Write a structure and sequence with these properties.
monomer, alpha/beta, globular, rna binding protein, 167 residues
Amino acid sequence: DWPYFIIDLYHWDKHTQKEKGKIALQVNQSYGLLRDYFTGSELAVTWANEEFREMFHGPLDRITTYGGPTSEFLKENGINEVVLLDPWAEEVLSEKDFDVKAFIIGGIVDPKIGEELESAGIKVRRRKIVLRGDVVGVPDRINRILGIILKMMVEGKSMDEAVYEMQ
């Protein structure tokens, strides 16, 4: 019943080797968070390729990995709508989004991920995280974004509270 939290590697080849290594770090940290709240398998990595997998020190059976497009992963799991965390979104993430079955928490680079998903028939809810209506103090790292969502979704905390706690 719990949603997937997706790290989308669509833009993998546009990153430096250091940025690739930071993504692997964020995957490990995000698994740690979801292993506490849930089981850990709710973390899903799409466009997972061999270079990404070789940045780890063991198999990734504990998380959901998927070599193909995010839209295909969603369709395989009967999901037709996702929340895309995007600081340029018009609407702020809220409790009315927590019935959606998948949240894309990483992958945006600035061919937009949201445009490609919509062209493949996936409804995309673009939602931003703010603090007092501003971005000051709002973390932009994947695992911290995830921590904010989980505090709101699991613990029922307001966004201001969740952002403050995750600073």
